[PDB]
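Reproducibility note. Readers wishing to regenerate the assembly model reported in the main text can use the exact inputs given here. Chain order matters: entities are listed in the order in which they were concatenated for prediction.
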Amino acid sequence: LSGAVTALILVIASVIIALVVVGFAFGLFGAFTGQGTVTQVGTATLSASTGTLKVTLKNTGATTQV
Amino acid sequence: LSGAVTALILVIASVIIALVVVGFAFGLFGAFTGQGTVTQVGTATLSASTGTLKVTLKNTGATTQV
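Running the prediction on these inputs yields the following structure tokens for the assembly.
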């Protein structure tokens, strides 16, 4: 009964492996969308006195660092 | 009457052994299906302050441990 049980245990475990792959793919597809994008909308000015940059940055995503 | 009784006791005991094998195989087939599978559906976030992970895990099986 090696073929009666072994291919059965493979076809049970393969459902688990396939669902883990599909869940990881959907989690990655959720992750890279809302990961965070930043662009400029505001036409920044660079002061020559101290280097202070008054920039305007649009961010439709998550919290980032400069 | 060695052949009249001995092959008889073997053919009686072999039914017991075969039924134990078939019952164990069906119990194993019941066991590995509902043993417990866990996947991700929820696109977890990892906070960098304390390492707190807010995950969402789908579990169509039994109680497991991390």
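We highlight two features of this model. Chain A has one helix and four strands. The first helix of chain A runs from residue 2 to 33.
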